[PDB]
Design a protein around this ligand. Structure first.
Ligand SMILES: Nc1ncnc2c1ncn2[C@@H]1O[C@H](COP(=O)(O)OP(=O)(O)OP(=O)(O)O)[C@@H](O)[C@H]1O
Ligand SMILES: [Mn+2]
Ligand SMILES: [Mn+2]
Length: 532
């Protein structure tokens, strides 16, 4: 307990260190629990919980302490270098938030989970997570790397994550913060503090943000991508924003899964940060996604799904949130890289996007300059009007396909990615997992056959022609793929109807890209973007 007292947490009478899966099951199903701690047992064998008022991350509540360690290296929200959520925090307000959390956890029954972030000993974080909520401990047991008993014996944390979801900050107005909630990081004390939000993804993406700070400064790419590997050792990575297909499409029975969301790329190859996968379950189809569906069993942890009185799950019900999720340890997938989630250098780099404007082609091979342009652009889009019965799509441009998690400037991630790709001779591709002129999403079946064709070389050998405006090389046909869909003009009444939309989208790309054109490298990439 005095070790806990070193963190500021007093008088803990009941300490649960390294809780087993069986204990976490017992704790969640305790009929005496109240409120959002409670779990419910589903007919699939997995416990389901509700994560409370927050059912996704709260970027507006994300703060990073600005001090002499971070001042000149962080990509700060206020430093005129493009928009981001790295809002500066004073060390004095940090101490206030730390007092809130440590007092909240003092005198409680605490779960302590030691885990690694990063598959390689030379660059991993040794993270100690502290929570008073059993399903939060379970989330981190699933999603981080579980140490061996030997690693546990000599465990030396170099980052502490203290989850005080049950406390809030009443001084937030005087302190200039956004709300009574907070997700704060301190790189001098090497700690994350959480208040107000119970959502487990803050811890997952928080540690991801810290890897995104430390690794590129050591020459190692740090990537919002999934990754898998063929029997020959050929590695693919799949970038993309939330919901664009990284987890869906890397979970592929023809490939060994490396990881689904967070990877590094060092001198030896591509390596997972995590010990689990965090899948979306909205409208989950057992036929369309059988491996992910099969992972939903005891020790998986369902979030915010609708569970019927009889224990069945209504996966289509988005009432609590569209962001229904399940975490599971990665070995709930049958065909994975083991015992360590890593492989060689990627030779296929796939940018996933869900184009709600219905303009981009299902697949295209990128030039080198197009790769850089679209990596910095980081496009996807949403049908935001759907619940009001309207389409109009809303663009998101998020640098590196994950600006919410970037702690350095986008160009620093671009430069090390390009360096790794060039050394490996990797080829890049752009895949629209989103919409076309039918006003419907491309089927998962068609997208998987597109991925197959990328990975087995058939797309590279295909005859291609250039789609106008975006100047994207697209194939005339592909094995097992519906041929009509390959040219996005074919799903509209006429190519001119596609063109009206392509022009709308091109202007959005051009306007977004302008902020990168204040270096000569950036200005020169304009020629690789869409052209009116
Ligand atoms: N053609 C398609 N390709 C891929 N996914 C599709 C397709 N059509 C529908 N989907 C659905 O879109 C979602 C893809 O989400 P997925 O979990 O792969 O996102 P992600 O990129 O892993 O995001 P995150 O980083 O937030 O975890 C799933 O709900 C999937 O069923
Ligand atoms: Mn995912
Ligand atoms: Mn993600």
């Amino acid at each position: 307990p005095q070790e806990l007292e070193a963190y500021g947490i007093s008088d803990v009478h009941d300490i649960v260190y390294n809780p087993s899966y069986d204990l976490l099951y017992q704790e969640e199903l305790d009929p005496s629990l109240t409120g959002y701690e409670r779990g419910v047992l589903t007919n699939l064998g997995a416990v389901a919980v509700d994560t409370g008022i927050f059912t996704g991350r709260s970027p507006k509540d994300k703060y990073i302490v600005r001090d002499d360690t971070t001042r000149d290296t962080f990509w700060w929200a206020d430093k005129g270098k493009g928009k981001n959520d790295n809002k500066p925090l004073s060390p004095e307000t940090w101490q206030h938030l730390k007092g809130l959390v440590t007092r909240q956890l003092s005198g409680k029954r605490l779960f302590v989970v030691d885990a690694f972030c990063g598959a390689n000993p030379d660059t991993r974080l040794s993270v100690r997570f502290i929570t008073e909520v059993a399903w939060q401990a379970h989330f981190v047991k699933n999603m981080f790397i579980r140490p061996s008993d030997e690693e546990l014996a000599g465990f030396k944390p170099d980052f502490i994550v203290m989850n005080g979801a049950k406390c809030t900050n009443p001084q937030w107005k005087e302190q200039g913060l956004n709300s009574e909630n907070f997700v704060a990081f301190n790189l001098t004390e090497r700690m994350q503090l959480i208040g107000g939000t119970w959502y487990g993804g803050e811890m997952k993406k928080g540690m991801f943000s810290m890897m995104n700070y430390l690794l590129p400064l050591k020459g190692i790419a740090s990537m919002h991508c999934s990754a898998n590997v063929g029997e020959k050792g050929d590695v693919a990575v799949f970038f993309g924003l939330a919901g664009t297909g990284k987890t869906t499409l890397s979970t592929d029975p023809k490939r060994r899964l490396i990881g689904d969301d967070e990877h590094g790329w060092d001198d030896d190859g591509v390596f997972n940060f995590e010990g689990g996968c965090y899948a979306k379950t909205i409208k989950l189809s057992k036929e369309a996604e059988p491996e992910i569906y099969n992972a939903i069993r005891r020790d998986a942890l369902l979030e915010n799904v609708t569970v019927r009185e009889d224990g069945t799950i209504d996966f289509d019900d988005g009432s609590k949130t569209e962001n229904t999720r399940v975490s599971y340890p990665i070995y709930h997938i049958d065909n994975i890289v083991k015992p360590v989630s890593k492989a060689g250098h990627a030779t296929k780099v796939i940018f996933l996007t869900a184009d709600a404007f219905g303009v981009l082609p299902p697949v295209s091979r990128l030039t080198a300059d197009q790769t850089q342009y679209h990596f910095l652009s980081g496009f996807t889009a949403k049908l935001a009007g759907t619940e009001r019965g309207i389409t109009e799509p809303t663009p998101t441009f998020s640098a590196c396909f994950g600006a919410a998690f970037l702690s350095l400037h986008p160009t620093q991630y671009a430069e090390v990615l390009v360096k790794r790709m060039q050394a490996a001779g990797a080829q890049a591709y752009l895949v629209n997992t989103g919409w076309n002129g039918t006003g419907k999403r491309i089927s998962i079946k068609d997208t998987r056959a597109i991925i197959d064709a990328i990975l087995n070389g058939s797309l590279d050998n295909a005859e291609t022609f250039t789609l106008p405006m975006f100047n994207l090389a697209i194939p005339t046909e592909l094995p097992g793929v519906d041929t009509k869909i390959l040219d996005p003009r074919n799903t509209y009444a006429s190519p001119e109807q596609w063109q009206e939309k392509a022009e709308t989208l091109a202007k959005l790309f051009i306007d977004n890209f302008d902020k990168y054109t204040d270096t000569p490298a950036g200005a020169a990439l304009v020629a690789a973007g869409p052209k009116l």
